[PDB]
Amino acid sequence: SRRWFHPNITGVEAENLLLTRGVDGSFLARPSGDFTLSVRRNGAVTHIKIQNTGDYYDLYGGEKFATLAELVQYYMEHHGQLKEDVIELKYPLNCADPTSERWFHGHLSGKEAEKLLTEKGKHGSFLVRESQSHPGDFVLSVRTGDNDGKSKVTHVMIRCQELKYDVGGGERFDSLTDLVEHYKKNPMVETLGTVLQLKQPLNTTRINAAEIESRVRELSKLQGFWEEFETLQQQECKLLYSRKEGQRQENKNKNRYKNILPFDHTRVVLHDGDPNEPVSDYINANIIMPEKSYIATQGCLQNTVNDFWRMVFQENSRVIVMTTKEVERGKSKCVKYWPDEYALKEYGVMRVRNVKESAAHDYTLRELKLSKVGQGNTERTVWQYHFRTWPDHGVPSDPGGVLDFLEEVHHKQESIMDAGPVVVHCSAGIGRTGTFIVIDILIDIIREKGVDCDIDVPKTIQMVRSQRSGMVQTEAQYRFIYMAVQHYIETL
Ligand SMILES: CC1(N)CCN(c2cnc3c(Sc4ccccc4Cl)n[nH]c3n2)CC1
Numbered sequence: 142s143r144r145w146f147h148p149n150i151t152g153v154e155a156e157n158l159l160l161t162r163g164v165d166g167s168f169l170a171r172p173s174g175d176f177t178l179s180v181r182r183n184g185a186v187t188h189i190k191i192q193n194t195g196d197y198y199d200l201y202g203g204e205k206f207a208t209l210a211e212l213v214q215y216y217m218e219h220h221g222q223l224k225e226d227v228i229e230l231k232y233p234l235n236c237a238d239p240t241s242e243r244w245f246h247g248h249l250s251g252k253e254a255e256k257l258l259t260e261k262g263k264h265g266s267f268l269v270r271e272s273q274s275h276p277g278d279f280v281l282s283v284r285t286g287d288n289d290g291k292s293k294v295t296h297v298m299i300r301c302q303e304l305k306y307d308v309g310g311g312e313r314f315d316s317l318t319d320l321v322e323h324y325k326k327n328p329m330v331e332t333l334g335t336v337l338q339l340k341q342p343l344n345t346t347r348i349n350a351a352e353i354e355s356r357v358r359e360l361s362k363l364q365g366f367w368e369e370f371e372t373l374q375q376q377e378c379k380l381l382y383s384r385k386e387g388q389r390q391e392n393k394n395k396n397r398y399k400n401i402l403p404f405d406h407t408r409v410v411l412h413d414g415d416p417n418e419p420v421s422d423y424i425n426a427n428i429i430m431p432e433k434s435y436i437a438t439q440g441c442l443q444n445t446v447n448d449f450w451r452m453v454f455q456e457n458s459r460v461i462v463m464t465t466k467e468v469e470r471g472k473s474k475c476v477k478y479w480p481d482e483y484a485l486k487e488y489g490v491m492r493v494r495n496v497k498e499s500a501a502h503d504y505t506l507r508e509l510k511l512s513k514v515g516q517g518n519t520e521r522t523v524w525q526y527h528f529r530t531w532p533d534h535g536v537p538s539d540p541g542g543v544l545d546f547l548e549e550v551h552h553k554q555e556s557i558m559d560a561g562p563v564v565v566h567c568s569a570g571i572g573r574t575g576t577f578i579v580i581d582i583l584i585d586i587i588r589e590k591g592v593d594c595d596i597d598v599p600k601t602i603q604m605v606r607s608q609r610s611g612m613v614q615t616e617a618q619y620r621f622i623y624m625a626v627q628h629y630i631e632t633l
Contacts, residue, residue: 143378145234147170147171148371159186169236174617175190178190197401198212204221210377215400239269242321244268245268248270249271251270251296254282257343267341268342269281269282269317278298283295285335308324346369348597353596356623366623373603380607384405391423397568401569403426407608409438412455428608430608431601436563437612450478452564454513456561459554462577463525464574479507487514490513491513495509505529508522509524528546540625544632551581579622591633
């Protein structure tokens with residue numbers, strides 16, 4: 142449900158909430174790109190800092206995580222010993238705000254809402270807005286139907302009385318979300334039969350590509366970007382798919398970050414593994430396919446370089462995108478899994494030759510030759526695109542170089558008949574990596590359909606996040622994906 146996240150409270154409001162409405166074990170998370178976990182223990186409120194500069198959520202005195210929901214789930218089911226004394230996350234302190242619900246539109250007239258539902262709704266599309274006739278109340282607007290008169294818009298008053306909500310009779314809810322949830326499971330039936338089924342929120346995030354700059358300006362006033370992003374973050378609770386294989390003891394040492402793991406149902410499975418190793422089928426990587434496909438994976442560790450090259454070989458991948466230096470801020474992010482220029486190396490049963498490096502402003506290109514040892518004729522060229530100028534924290538101020546990069550990469554991939562997924566990695570393989578993949582997916586739509594096409598940035602991000610945890614980490618990357626797509630639209 143993710144209700145333990147309060148998008149707009151203060152520290153003192155968080156302590157007050159935990160001391161007066163929580164008990165020991167009660168907790169909540171809140172933003173300050175930094176966040177805080179606030180936890181009551183022994184009648185006192187502690188605040189634990191979470192940092193995310195773009196690769197993962199770094200929790201002080203804890204582990205690193207792909208999403209806040211996975212962070213909370215870990216410390217609520219595994220012990221994870223969040224210590225400091227031990228800090229236990231027992232009871233979510235739920236937030237009642239509706240401001241990051243997909244169906245909440247706050248300020249919105251009835252005629253604007255009828256038009257929105259008319260132009261872009263279907264039977265069951267709905268939304269909730271602030272009542273204008275009755276200050277303080279709210280309105281639920283639903284579309285139902287099959288301009289032939291076969292459809293209609295129905296409005297329903299939501300009374301707000303003593304901070305509780307109701308539709309004029311029956312139960313009174315502590316939040317608009319509790320009311321919507323309730324009347325989603327138990328639809329409202331009009332007198333003459335029509336059941337007001339709340340099937341899906343009206344989609345407002347989808348735009349036509351030509352109007353990108355207009356939306357980017359809309360999102361840049363008072364900020365709209367943060368609202369839209371945090372409404373996406375609110376959807377991360379639906380993506381807690383199992384990641385059992387990555388948690389196996391034999392696979393623990395193959396994870397760069399212990400708790401950042403691939404979903405079981407999209408992970409890359411490696412076959413033809415030597416039968417000597419009990420578990421030879423595992424790597425930290427997920428197939429990403431827009432629903433050109435991709436593999437999103439972490440930066441190699443010394444002990445997974447051989448498994449990485451089994452992946453590349455097995456999937457017929459011909460292009461690798463690296464978006465990290467080998468070492469950043471003095472810390473290892475990816476071991477050097479390719480040979481020096483002109484050299485030849487064996488990695489297990491795989492052999493790689495670095496044929497030639499080419500240096501451009503933002504990136505180096507390494508032309509690798511990959512084959513299986515003892516089996517001539519399996520050789521194929523793999524092109525390694527190594528973006529080197531990405532900032533250690535945050536994102537670039539201008540998307541130009543990233544776009545020139547992705548364009549080259551796309552043309553290489555397209556030029557190779559029956560090439561496999563493009564491999565993309567950074568350190569953890571979710572933040573820079575998801576940003577680059579999402580940008581590439583959006584640009585691909587436009588490449589094929591021109592500027593006269595529909596794009597939906599959060600929808601695409603959600604779709605990539607169902608295939609690997611936390612794809613796209615921060616609001617800064619979110620804005621950067623917009624800004625990149627804008628700049629691509631204006632170069633055509
Ligand atoms: C006015 C608002 N308060 C409410 C409506 N708006 C949305 C709508 N949808 C989302 C998502 S998710 C998502 C989007 C598209 C398809 C599928 C999914 Cl799951 N994240 N943020 C969002 N904001 C903007 C802010």
